[model samples]
Target chain A: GDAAVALDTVTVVGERYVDDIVATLTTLRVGMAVLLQRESGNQYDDNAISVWTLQHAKLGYIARYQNQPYATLMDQGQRLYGIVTVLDQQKQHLELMLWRLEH
Target chain B: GDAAVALDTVTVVGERYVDDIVATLTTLRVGMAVLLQRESGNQYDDNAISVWTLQHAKLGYIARYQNQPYATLMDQGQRLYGIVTVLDQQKQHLELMLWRLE
Candidate 1:
């Protein structure tokens, strides 16, 4: 989990093609750290958790189905952080190394 | 994170063989849920975390190196829980699925 490896590889879905901002403004390289925060009051999804950079660059929203736990944790004052894994076919797709809930 | 799968495979080291308690009294299956709690004030390691069952069956202490984060999280009031994975050569060896201080 400390290495930012693929605990879960999820795609950040949206038409958020502000690709230039992340590409140019921040270091979107492998192993770079990213922060995941719950986006409450979001008009779309109640379980919204948004990912970002330390520099405050907006990445995108974590998918609905996969975002519930992280959102729940954040509601309880837990801060979620992740590292960028691989950027292949989709730059929006990154691995989040979280270890919160279990089956 | 919520798998009961292999986040990290750790060895519970000790000579205390209450192995019969776990072996007989409990259902130590592949997907069995195990609870991990801080064993604070342990003379050997302040970062001690002990694994157990809901029935209060004692397993053993988590090793020094890998137990830190879990210990820290417990200090911060985070409940650490995991599910048992493969039990092969070492029945004492089980996987803990935690996501607190990653």
Candidate 2:
């Protein structure tokens, strides 16, 4: 639904995965949809949300310190969506502006 | 609880509440106990933890962005306590080392 009240913006973190990141990062552009999918493969912590391009190419992750809130929001059945906002190829960085799709 | 695990240290914020802050802050010394208490009177966000000197002088609060995690920990029956670690009198700043009391 388009009724999403634009939520806080967050930087897509874990750019340390240099290979997977550099692979799809060159294809990135502003305004492309960003997707946050919960991951069970994350063995280190709870409430992991993996970031991806709309084409389903894996980017990296939402940062750890702030992901718990996003995880709770998602688990509560609230919908969240993001749009690519920044990309720093030199630093291998990216950011996305998120919104809740309120039906 | 003495079985507490030492958690991260945090800065006591809202120093802008200058009068209450200035009054008791002068009496502060390193290693004094610090306390975090929940408040319903907060007209703002979902989780609010008010900070205080163990003597009951109101200091300020845990920062807004990080309080949610601490608040959850407190609500889940895990306990937290603090010890004063830093005092920047010139800047009117304070830091506390916290532990999760088992």
Stretches of candidate 2 exceeding 4 Å from the true structure: A1-103
Clashes of each: 5, 0
lDDT by residue (A56-81, candidate 2, tens digit) is: 77787787776888888888888887
Candidate 1 positional error at A3, Å = 12
True contacts kept of each: 0.00, 0.00
| iRMS values for every prediction | 21.7, 14.9
- How much is the lDDT of residue A69 in candidate 2? 83
Per-candidate DockQ vs. reference: 0.01, 0.02
The stretch of ten residues in a row with the least summed lDDT in candidate 1 chain A is A1-10
Per-model TM-score, in order, reads: 0.40, 0.48
RMSD of each: 18.5, 11.9
lDDT of 2 by residue, B1-102 (tens): 458788887777766553467778887889888888875344333366777877888777776546766777887877788888998776778888878887
Q: RMSD in angstroms, candidate 2?
A: 11.9
lDDT of 1: 0.59
